[PDB]
């Protein structure tokens, strides 16, 4: 049970939020990449994936599948899940909004070409008029350095991570939000985070059109 | 307040799992139905919704949004979340597969006719070959009456609810699973569950495509 083992393709996808959480907690981990459909098949057939899906993480003797379940477990284990019921409620509400924002932006690459522009316009609108203002408001409401409980929790990490993708999506979206900029800088300066951001870490890059098309093809899954 | 207040459309949607969890816990609740676009606009403008979305539940001084955030809080508050992080890891993984199954079947009524048939076949294949076998397997792995910790938890309620939707979708899907059939009757027999299953409770009915198109027309939500 030394280092947790992360089962996923060699890409961000749904496993990146988990890599971010482990890195932030300073927890060393290994990765076993699914490079071929045959790799994915073996995992399923061997009974390692409860729903024949990844993310799957081997940790503390479990074969834990489902992103949210992996995150909640890691967050609790390393005291990054607040101190009680009420703090976890704020943490979960904020985190679900961030996961929604992450999916809205990330799914654009899979949109049918004829729907892509409209979907992209809607995503930019939601990002700048619904999500960014919501988080800027949280920070303003209490003036604290962290989102919840005046101390670092998993959602501070989730927010930094999604702001990076917002910056990749459209850098002008962040301009109107001073507190979030300040927050991004603060979280980025934490030792474990800075280290994960530097070149050479297990942090993953975005995938380009050709890659996406090629990878999604060889595996074929509806 | 005293009784939690559930803000949602008069329909199942994302709020139904919450009505179920509360009903099961024997906690009485009230509902404030969103019956028109104006109702929804009012809720937003008055500062009720963190991300201008429902579900939103008023409980213990919070105006809590995000389905999962609401479910996690209620489950913890009423001792339906197991006893430790390891039981919660199983409860969470199970719950997420159930939510995935619910969405997969629920989405069908929004598939354009030239896509619905194939999407329906996929949903049935996934239900009987991926999802149901997974839960039948958990029940067989310990031979106990409940999914986790040999005690009623939130996931036994989530599993009963989704079994109802699978039964509405295609009853013959359940026949090959004797343990799931026995589990269904057992959970259905619990006092609070029996109360919620009987006529006149706050449980909600399904909505055909016709009903969907109609309602989802008046609001013109993107
Ligand atoms: N609610 C669950 C969801 C789990 C889930 O969907 N997992 C996917 C991989 S992630 C994602 C996904 C799928 C297919 C592929 C196929 C090739 C591929 C190559 C390189 C990187 C990724 C990254 C993500 C991904 C996929 C790839 C597509 O399944 C979907 O589009 C998923 O959204 C999977 O294992 N698919 C195998 C299969 O169903 O039999 C959770 O949160 O954990
Ligand atoms: N991750 C979050 C998701 C929250 C969420 O998506 N909420 C939706 C309602 S649920 C669902 C939804 C939408 C629109 C409508 C519009 C009319 C409508 C009438 C009667 C019943 C439902 C049931 C669901 C529903 C909708 C209706 C469509 O938004 C989507 O399709 C949603 O998936 C909403 O409030 N939309 C208002 C808006 O964005 O401004 C969570 O789990 O809590």
UniProtKB/Swiss-Prot annotation, chains A, B:
Tissues and organs where the protein is expressed, per its UniProt entry: Expressed in the liver, skin and kidney.
EC numbers for this chain: 2.5.1.18, 1.11.1.-, 5.3.3.-
Catalytic reactions on record: RX + glutathione = an S-substituted glutathione + a halide anion + H(+); prostaglandin A2 + glutathione = prostaglandin A2-S-(R)-glutathione; prostaglandin J2 + glutathione = prostaglandin J2-S-(R)-glutathione; (13S)-hydroperoxy-(9Z,11E)-octadecadienoate + 2 glutathione = (13S)-hydroxy-(9Z,11E)-octadecadienoate + glutathione disulfide + H2O
GO CC terms of this entry: cytosol; mitochondrion
Residues bearing the modification N-acetylalanine: 1
Pfam families registered for this protein in UniProt: GST_C, GST_N
Residue numbers of N6-succinyllysine PTMs: 3
InterPro entries in alphabetical order: Glutathione-S-Trfase_C-like (IPR010987), Glutathione-S-Trfase_C_sf (IPR036282), Glutathione_S-Trfase (IPR040079), Glutathione_S-Trfase_N (IPR004045), GST_alpha (IPR003080), GST_C (IPR004046), GST_superfamily (IPR050213), Thioredoxin-like_sf (IPR036249)
Keywords on record: Acetylation, Isomerase, Lipid metabolism, Oxidoreductase, Peroxidase, Transferase
Domain annotation GST C-terminal: ranges: 84-207
Binding site for glutathione: 8, 44, 53-54, 66-67
A single MF term (Gene Ontology): glutathione transferase activity
Induction trigger: Induced in the liver by beta-naphthoflavone (BNF) and 2(3)-t-butyl-4-hydroxyanisole (BHA).
Residue ranges constituting the GST N-terminal domain according to the UniProt record: 2-82
Signal sequence, start to end: none
GO biological process annotation, one example: prostaglandin metabolic process
Similarity annotation: Belongs to the GST superfamily. Alpha family.
Summary of subunit composition and partner proteins: Homodimer.
Function: Glutathione S-transferase that catalyzes the nucleophilic attack of the sulfur atom of glutathione on the electrophilic groups of a wide range of exogenous and endogenous compounds. Involved in the formation of glutathione conjugates of both prostaglandin A2 (PGA2) and prostaglandin J2 (PGJ2). It also catalyzes the isomerization of D5-androstene-3,17-dione (AD) into D4-androstene-3,17-dione and may therefore play an important role in hormone biosynthesis.
Full protein name: Glutathione S-transferase A1
């Amino acid at each position: 049970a030394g280092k947790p083992v992360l089962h996923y393709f060699n890409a961000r996808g749904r496993m990146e939020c988990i890599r971010w959480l482990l890195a932030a907690a300073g927890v060393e981990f290994e990765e076993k990449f699914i490079q071929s459909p045959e790799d994915l098949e073996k995992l399923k057939k061997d009974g390692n994936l409860m729903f024949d899906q990844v993310p799957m993480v081997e940790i503390d003797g479990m074969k834990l599948a489902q992103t949210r379940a992996i995150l909640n477990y890691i967050a609790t284990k390393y005291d990054l899940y607040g101190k009680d019921m009420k703090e976890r409620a704020l943490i979960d509400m904020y985190s679900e909004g961030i996961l929604d924002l992450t999916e809205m932006i990330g799914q654009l690459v899979l949109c049918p070409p004829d729907q892509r522009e409209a979907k992209t316009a809607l995503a930019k609108d939601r990002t700048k008029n619904r999500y960014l203002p919501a988080f800027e408001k949280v920070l303003k409401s209490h003036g604290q350095d962290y989102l919840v409980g005046n101390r670092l929790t998993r959602v501070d990490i989730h927010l930094l991570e999604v702001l990076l993708y917002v910056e990749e999506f459209d850098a002008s979206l962040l301009t109107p939000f001073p507190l979030l900029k300040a927050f991004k800088s603060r979280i980025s300066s934490l030792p474990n985070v800075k280290k994960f951001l530097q070149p050479g870490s297990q942090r993953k890059p975005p995938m380009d059109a050709k890659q996406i098309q090629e990878a999604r093809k060889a595996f074929k899954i509806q």
